[PDB]
Structure 1
């Protein structure tokens, strides 16, 4: 995770404007709509048959908040992503059996959501810094797989 000081500031600046609850819901919902394969892990969530069923599903919304909350906390520890996510890594591998490729898909969808919410302000350089962050989080979440 090679982040320059000005990348780190850029990432932090913007994130301060993010309503994590809302963006969490939007990012998880979009993952399940755009990449329906990811629905294999959420069959207990009820109806995911159409976009409105997914996006407005209270369980998808609650899970989105939990996911992005952990992600925010990760942004407070950019210099130790691996330690920060170690127990979540193990959980995702041994208990949930989630193929880590899904972490990369969520990261990209999160980038589209950030662009959607911020428009202009999500300049090419800000996007580049966020691409590094989502890749690092994805790699940290995969690190304990065995």
Structure 2
């Protein structure tokens, strides 16, 4: 599912994104509500307005675990299963939105590192996102 060439591409883009997770995650999330107002249903006790406190304290964790998944990739499927419940059992997310967040996370990278996110690096992440995609929806498959 995720071979050598991938591992290198994925790790790469990351220590790039790294020290700005408190805004690469907030942006992403700030973009998935503003393109996709339906994902808002999962957030009805959230401050959704531009730049708010709850989104940046949040988004931080969407990479905080997005890169903890990066620097331990040999087993994504294990380190993230903790949430794969919160996602699969507790909140129950429709799998058709890991995408809508899959992407809005590549509309961030893109904006800030348009010359790193070459197609191949774009591929690995988008396949690693398909990694953090499936594991987080464990309870169904």
Fold agreement, TM-score > 0.5: yes
For 2:139 and 2:68, the matched residues in 1 are separated by 19
Cα deviation, residue 123, structure 1: 1.0
Match of 2:40 in 1: 39
Tell which deviates more after alignment, 102-111 or 34-43.
102-111
Q: CA deviation at 1:104?
A: 2.0
Question: Matches of 1:9 and 1:2 in 2, distance apart?
Answer: 10
Counterpart CA distance in 2 for 1:62 and 1:2 is 31
CA shift, 1:97, in A, is 2.3
Query: Are the equivalent residues in 1 in contact too, given 2:29–2:101 (CA < 8 A)?
Result: yes
For the pair 1:9 / 2:8, whether they are aligned, the reply is yes
Gaps of 5+ in 1: none
Q: Which has the higher helix share?
A: 1
Is 1:110 the equivalent of 2:117?
no
CA apart distance, 1:76: 1.8
Contact 1:89-1:141 within 8 A present in 2 as well? yes
Other-structure match for 1:94: 89
Q: Taking structure 1 as the reference length, what is the TM-score of the superposition?
A: 0.86
Would you identify which runs of 4 or more consecutive aligned residues in structure 1 move more than 3 Å? none
